[PDB]
Amino acid sequence: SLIVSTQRPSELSPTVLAMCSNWFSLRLTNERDLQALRYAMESGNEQILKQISGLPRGDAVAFGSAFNLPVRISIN
Amino acid sequence: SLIVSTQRPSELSPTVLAMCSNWFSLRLTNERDLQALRYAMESGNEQILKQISGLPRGDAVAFGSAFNLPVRISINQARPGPKSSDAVFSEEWAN
Amino acid sequence: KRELNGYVFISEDWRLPALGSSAVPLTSDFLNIIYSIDKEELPKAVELGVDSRTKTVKIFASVDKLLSRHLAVLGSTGYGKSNFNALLTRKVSEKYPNSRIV
Ligand SMILES: Nc1ncnc2c1ncn2[C@@H]1O[C@H](COP(=O)(O)OP(=O)(O)O)[C@@H](O)[C@H]1O
Ligand SMILES: [Mg+2]
């Protein structure tokens, strides 16, 4: 098991991005991290990604192989 | 006969993918794979290759010299079928 | 247009008719003229096949005009390049095999 909580994953080879099970995206502004996240991000989801600029406090989006369709998750 | 099986055609060698005279293609997941997968076809078109992303389990797309026109075929489930050799965390956590 | 006692086909494409002129279909008699040779290479012509849309008019070609420069035959893999090559070179290169195919 490898669950790495980091903010600079670009130092990891991009080939490993294919074996992940769920993708998380908080407020991202820096070019490299967001570009790497989009580099292996499931197609068909553009509207929710571009609207991140208007996210209120504590708002986030989370989905992946466990979430069949896109969800806006606010953790209780 | 040589049969090539993989899950990343876009990262595969172009000549490896081109040593085929018939085709039976199943689901391919990522969208970025289609960039180099667009060359994979030899006797087909684009109207039927765009529905591989949504192909469910067990179905396939067949085109070649043995078919008049490309078809989407629902292959029957094999009896008996394959088995699994990997456990689940719940079985171990039972103690 | 008429020349002496028959007709001839020209390949100029800026002449247009006038308003109110009637429209007629083309008969096989006028279709023969469009797909013919220049009245002088008839004894030196080879028959290849027939047109597709109407399958009524034959096609002839000049020996000197064909086998004088580069000639190319195209196709696709798994589509008959071997088959089409064999058939076409069979029907074209019978009487005069003296040409070179390295
Ligand atoms: N005498 C014939 N009559 C009818 N069909 C023919 C004849 N000879 C060849 N063909 C057709 O031409 C096709 C040639 O394709 P093929 O040679 O298999 O392609 P490739 O050589 O690129 O694999 C065949 O499908 C065959 O049905
Ligand atoms: Mg061939």
- Can the peptide bond before residue B80 be classed as cis, meaning omega within 30 degrees of 0? yes
Tokens of C15: 């002449």
The alpha carbon of B19 and the centre of ligand 2 are apart by a number of angstroms equal to 13
Task: Dig out the tokens for A49 from the structure.
Answer: 């990604």
The experimental method is cryo-EM
B21 contacts chain C (CB < 8 A): yes
Distance linking the first and last C-alpha atoms of chain B:
49
Beta strands in chain C (DSSP E): 45-50, 58-62
| Shortest CA gap C76–chain B (Å) | 9
Residue C92: C-alpha distances to residues A74, C66, C68, C73, C96 (Å): 77, 10, 14, 12, 9
Using the mean position of ligand 1's atoms as its centre, give its distance from the Cα of residue C80 in Å: 5
Resolution in A, one decimal? Answer: 3.2
**Ligand 2 mean position, distance from CA C77 (Å):** 4
In short, whether C80's Cβ falls inside 6 Å of ligand 1 is: yes
Mutate-to-test residue for ligand 1 from C74, C79, C83, highest number of ligand atoms within 8 A of CB: C83
| Best of A37, A43, A69 to mutate (most B CBs within 10 Å, chain B) | A43
Instruction: Check if B65 contacts C (Cβ < 8 Å).
Output: yes
Rounded distance between C-alpha atoms, residue C72 and residue C69, angstroms:
10
Rounded to the nearest 5 degrees, what angle is found at the Cα of B15, between the Cα atoms of B10 and B17?
Answer: 50
Are A26 and A56 in contact by the 8 Å Cβ rule? The answer is no
Q: Which residues contact A22 (CB under 8 A, 6 or more apart)?
A: A62, A63, A64, A65, A66, A67
Rounded Cα–Cα distance for residues B60 and B27 (Å): 7
